[PDB]
Design a protein around this ligand. Sequence first.
Ligand SMILES: Cn1cnc2ccc([C@H]3CCC[C@H]3C(=O)O)cc21
Length: 165
Amino acid sequence: SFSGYLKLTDNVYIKNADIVEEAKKVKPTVVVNAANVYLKHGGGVAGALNKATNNAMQVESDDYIATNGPLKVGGSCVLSGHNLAKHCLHVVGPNVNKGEDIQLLKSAYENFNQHEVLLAPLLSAGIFGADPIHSLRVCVDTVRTNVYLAVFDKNLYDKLVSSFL
Ligand SMILES: Cn1cnc2ccc([C@H]3CCC[C@H]3C(=O)O)cc21
């Protein structure tokens, strides 16, 4: 099971870890990808998860978009977790660097409530351009299921713990 996490609330846990390395160790039922609407997994968490699957995540994702069209910002889809997890929940948080509405971050975290336990990154933070302190606050105030957050950047992890209310 999950180890070395700091408990933040009744249901939210956090650790300074690379989500690919965590997924390889734990083999969680669900790993969350920080996806975009086209499921083009180029960089950040998505680029890292897809590389760890030897591009199988991108081949599956292209077939999903060909059949279904793009996701909505704030939406999600459940696809295979390949060699990392049973499932991958691809969730699209708003990208502030593309000018998207930060108010959609709560809708994006609501997708997590459809799963009892998840390994996840902070949505909309990192290269998506939003404040990670705000993303952690929306996560705690929105997700009711058990979420294990992997924060890759050590300096960011220390900042998030020290500023958590
Ligand atoms: C590259 N990579 C691997 N595992 C990750 C988990 C998280 C992240 C990003 C998501 C937004 C906040 C940022 C971070 O926690 O440092 C990137 C990762």
